[PDB]
Ligand binder design. Structure first.
Ligand SMILES: [Zn+2]
Ligand SMILES: [Zn+2]
Ligand SMILES: [Zn+2]
Ligand SMILES: [Zn+2]
Ligand SMILES: [Zn+2]
Ligand SMILES: [Zn+2]
Length: 180
């Protein structure tokens, strides 16, 4: 399996709704939880492992044997809080890059579970932070899109180094450029 890194176009592509809840989906969710634990995550979205579908696995505790394994199919953020807060975010698609993103402190979510039943849920603090980050992946949004101009400048070069790695690996021009 593999983590997709910026600027790979997968991370910007349209993510398709899921209509079929079968042994296949069950198996994908599990591979995903496993990459998330492998990488010490609290959340993980399908595009980041190379699949453009609206699926996120999430465990608020972010550790084996703690919290609860939540599957979020076709999720939507129904409400954001007015209260906002800063936090140094990372992202597996940008190895070793950390910078301040301001986000709402809490959210209310609607999604479907592994059998397709509709549920909602509310998150705050660190789970809400990560949820928002992962949910952005599902909307083709990456964390630097949410940074101020000042903060983006601090990570420009690091993003350009990733643009270059893409161009060297693929022989294609980087499809997006932070210069832009
Ligand atoms: Zn692999
Ligand atoms: Zn497993
Ligand atoms: Zn951990
Ligand atoms: Zn992710
Ligand atoms: Zn990310
Ligand atoms: Zn430049």
């Amino acid at each position: 399996m593999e983590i997709v890194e910026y600027p790979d176009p997968i991370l910007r592509a349209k993510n398709k709704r899921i209509d079929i809840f079968d042994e296949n989906l069950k198996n994908l969710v599990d591979a995903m939880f496993d990459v998330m634990y492998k990488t010490d995550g609290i959340g993980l979205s399908a595009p980041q492992v190379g699949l453009n579908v609206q699926l996120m696995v999430f465990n608020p505790a972010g550790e084996p044997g703690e919290g609860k394994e939540i599957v979020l199919v076709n999720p939507k953020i129904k409400k954001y809080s007015d209260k906002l807060v800063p936090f140094d975010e990372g992202c597996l698609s940008f190895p070793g890059i950390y910078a301040e993103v301001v986000r709402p402190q809490s959210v209310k979510i609607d999604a479907r579970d592994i059998t397709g039943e509709r549920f909602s849920i509310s998150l705050s603090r660190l789970p809400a932070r990560i949820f928002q980050h992962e949910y952005d992946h599902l909307e083709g949004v990456l964390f630097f899109d949410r940074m101020t101009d000042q903060v983006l400048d601090s990570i420009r070069e690091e993003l350009e180094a990733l643009e270059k790695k893409y161009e060297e690996k693929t022989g294609l021009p980087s499809p997006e450029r932070v210069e832009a």
